Amino acid sequence: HMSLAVEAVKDFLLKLQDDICEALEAEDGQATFVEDKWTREGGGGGRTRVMVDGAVIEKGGVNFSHVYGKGLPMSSTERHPDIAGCNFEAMGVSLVIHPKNPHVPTSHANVRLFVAEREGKEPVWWFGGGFDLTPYYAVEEDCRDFHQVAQDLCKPFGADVYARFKGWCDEYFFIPYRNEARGIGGLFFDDLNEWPFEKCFEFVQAVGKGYMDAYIPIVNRRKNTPYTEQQVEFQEFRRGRYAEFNLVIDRGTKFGLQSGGRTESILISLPPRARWGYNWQPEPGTPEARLTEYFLTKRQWV
Amino acid sequence: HHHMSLAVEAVKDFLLKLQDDICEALEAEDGQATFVEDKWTREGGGGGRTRVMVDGAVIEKGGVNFSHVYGKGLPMSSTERHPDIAGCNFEAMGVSLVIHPKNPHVPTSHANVRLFVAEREGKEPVWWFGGGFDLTPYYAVEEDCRDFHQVAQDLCKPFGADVYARFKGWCDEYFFIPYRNEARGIGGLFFDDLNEWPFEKCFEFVQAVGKGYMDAYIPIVNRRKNTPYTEQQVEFQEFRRGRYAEFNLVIDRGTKFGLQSGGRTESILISLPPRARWGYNWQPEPGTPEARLTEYFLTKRQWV
Ligand SMILES: O=C(O)c1cc2cc(F)ccc2[nH]1
Numbered sequence: 050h051m052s053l054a055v056e057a058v059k060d061f062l063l064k065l066q067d068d069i070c071e072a073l074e075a076e077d078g079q080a081t082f083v084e085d086k087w088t089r090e091g092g093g094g095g096r097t098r099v100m101v102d103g104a105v106i107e108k109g110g111v112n113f114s115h116v117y118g119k120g121l122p123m124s125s126t127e128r129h130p131d132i133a134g135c136n137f138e139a140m141g142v143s144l145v146i147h148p149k150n151p152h153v154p155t156s157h158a159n160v161r162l163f164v165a166e167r168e169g170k171e172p173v174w175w176f177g178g179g180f181d182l183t184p185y186y187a188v189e190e191d192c193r194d195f196h197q198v199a200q201d202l203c204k205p206f207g208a209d210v211y212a213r214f215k216g217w218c219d220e221y222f223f224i225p226y227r228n229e230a231r232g233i234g235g236l237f238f239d240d241l242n243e244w245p246f247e248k249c250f251e252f253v254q255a256v257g258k259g260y261m262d263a264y265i266p267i268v269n270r271r272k273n274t275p276y277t278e279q280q281v282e283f284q285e286f287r288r289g290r291y292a293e294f295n296l297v298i299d300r301g302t303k304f305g306l307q308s309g310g311r312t313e314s315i316l317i318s319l320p321p322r323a324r325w326g327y328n329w330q331p332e333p334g335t336p337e338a339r340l341t342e343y344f345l346t347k348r349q350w351v
Numbered sequence: 352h353h354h355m356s357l358a359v360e361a362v363k364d365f366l367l368k369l370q371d372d373i374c375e376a377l378e379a380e381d382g383q384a385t386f387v388e389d390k391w392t393r394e395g396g397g398g399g400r401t402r403v404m405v406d407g408a409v410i411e412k413g414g415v416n417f418s419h420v421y422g423k424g425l426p427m428s429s430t431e432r433h434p435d436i437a438g439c440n441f442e443a444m445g446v447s448l449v450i451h452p453k454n455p456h457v458p459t460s461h462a463n464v465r466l467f468v469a470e471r472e473g474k475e476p477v478w479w480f481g482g483g484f485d486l487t488p489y490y491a492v493e494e495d496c497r498d499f500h501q502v503a504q505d506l507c508k509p510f511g512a513d514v515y516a517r518f519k520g521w522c523d524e525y526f527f528i529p530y531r532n533e534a535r536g537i538g539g540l541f542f543d544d545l546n547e548w549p550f551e552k553c554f555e556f557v558q559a560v561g562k563g564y565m566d567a568y569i570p571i572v573n574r575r576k577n578t579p580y581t582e583q584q585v586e587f588q589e590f591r592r593g594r595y596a597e598f599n600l601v602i603d604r605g606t607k608f609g610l611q612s613g614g615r616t617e618s619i620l621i622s623l624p625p626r627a628r629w630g631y632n633w634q635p636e637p638g639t640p641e642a643r644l645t646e647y648f649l650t651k652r653q654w655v
């Protein structure tokens with residue numbers, strides 16, 4: 050019976066959300082998050098905060114969800130058969146930020162906790178999450194700083210923690226049919242429970258704080274970079290690739306929509322505008338081609 | 352076999368001509384842009400011709416593809432619905448198209464005709480046909496929906512009293528976004544695993560279906576292409592094309608199977624719109640012609 054450990058987690062997630070929103074509002078200075086609190090048939094709910102048409106953030110969502118349920122949904126019994134009929138609690142923050150300026154990267158973060166209550170056995174549980182950076186017109190110094198924040202926050206938890214979860218981020222956020230990474234990586238983890246519960250929780254706190262320390266400065270630094278409408282077009286074609294990942298490959302997006310999740314809360318990840326063209330490529334040799342030729346394939350920043 | 356090999360080739364030839372014919376008709380309606388052909392050759396066996404059209408007077412993004420692929424043993428994600436024929440030599444061919452008009456008052460449309468054949472040693476071959484056609488309007492007109500369906504009902508009739516009912520029903524169940532509780536378009540025809548009839552009969556049906564597409568769709572384009580439209584209308588169109596992307600990337604099996612089994616990405620994804628939009632809790636204004644698409648047309652389902 051972890052009810053109080055779970056409440057501590059809940060209290061943190063709600064605070065992280067406030068903390069990310071406030072910070073992002075402070076960067077925009079024009080628009081604020083509008084909140085949409087929701088509920089489901091015997092399944093808790095969430096508080097979806099969205100920002101649209103700001104000075105800096107064109108489309109942005111920072112969601113809190115807390116899902117109850119009797120028996121895991123149908124899709125999870127393929128991955129988690131051993132606890133398919135269990136009472137479960139799932140709670141987390143998910144965010145995707147799509148800046149107006151192409152020179153500010155898109156970014157994503159997640160912290161979450163799954164707890165399954167067992168008949169006779171102590172409860173099964175794991176954390177999960179990460180953050181990652183999806184530049185359009187990348188900047189070396191930004192990528193390095195991003196990753197450095199990730200490695201630094203990992204340092205207190207073990208010597209191999211960054212390596213493992215950085216690599217996991219590279220493997221996960223990849224479009225195999227296009228042989229192409231989605232962004233320049235960051236951290237990614239799941240089924241985190243090898244450490245005692247308190248050490249894992251502290252880790253996800255560090256990942257939550259880590260996001261704001263990694264991303265906010267990059268937004269402050271590049272938001273006022275001047276951009277042409279040609280660069281917006283490139284950005285819109287790149288967002289096609291983002292839509293693909295989220296709709297074709299992403300496991301949480303897929304599981305969110307299969308199992309009865311709130312569509313509009315799940316799909317805050319989709320960009321404001323996206324373009325697709327037959328055989329679309331950026332002109333090789335340009336800043337536009339450099340993203341895929343250099344930035345997406347480096348996979349070694351720190 | 353001999354008879355099947357001879358028949359398979361009659362099917363190819365039909366498909367190659369179907370494509371020229373569809374492209375010609377579509378070029379005839381545009382007047383301005385013409386299809387560009389991109390021939391490609393699978394490393395393993397076969398290939399295809401992808402024909403696309405961009406920035407037309409009428410067709411903003413158009414894709415009419417032909418494939419004929421063939422190999423030793425099926426791909427890895429075909430050991431799940433067809434494990435018993437995963438080591439067989441196979442042939443899969445077909446024509447697949449998606450048309451996205453510049454004008455919002457011209458519906459997007461899609462059509463597909465294909466054949467899969469798996470040659471088996473000593474046992475008769477396994478084979479089936481599949482495909483159909485469907486209409487995805489933005490600003491739907493009643494008369495066009497009825498007509499589109501009558502053309503489908505008419506081509507089916509000679510094949511049997513219940514054929515239109517099955518494949519029109521199937522179209523509604525298939526092209527549907529469950530998580531949004533929302534149809535994709537106003538329907539049409541859809542069928543898969545078609546081998547219930549002798550080969551020759553199934554084949555003639557897909558030929559009817561293929562001809563049906565031009566008969567159903569080209570008049571509608573000709574009728575609507577010069578309808579005046581606003582930037583506000585194009586904006587609704589692009590939000591609606593978010594739903595279209597959604598279906599193809601999240602739900603469509605053909606896209607799933609193609610992308611995960613080593614098919615040619617840009618060819619598979621001609622289906623995707625030139626521009627799309629998403630907004631959190633975006634819905635058309637109630638009481639507007641925009642809202643009428645989802646409130647009426649998409650839930651109507653009964654046209655003929
Ligand atoms: O695997 C999951 O269940 C899951 C992945 C994921 C990613 C997000 F960004 C948000 C919620 C999620 N849930």
Ligand SMILES: O=C(O)c1cc2cc(F)ccc2[nH]1
Pocket residue numbers: 445447448462463465604605606608
């Ligand atoms: O099920 C398939 O293999 C398949 C479905 C499909 C749909 C299209 F529009 C085009 C080709 C296809 N192949």
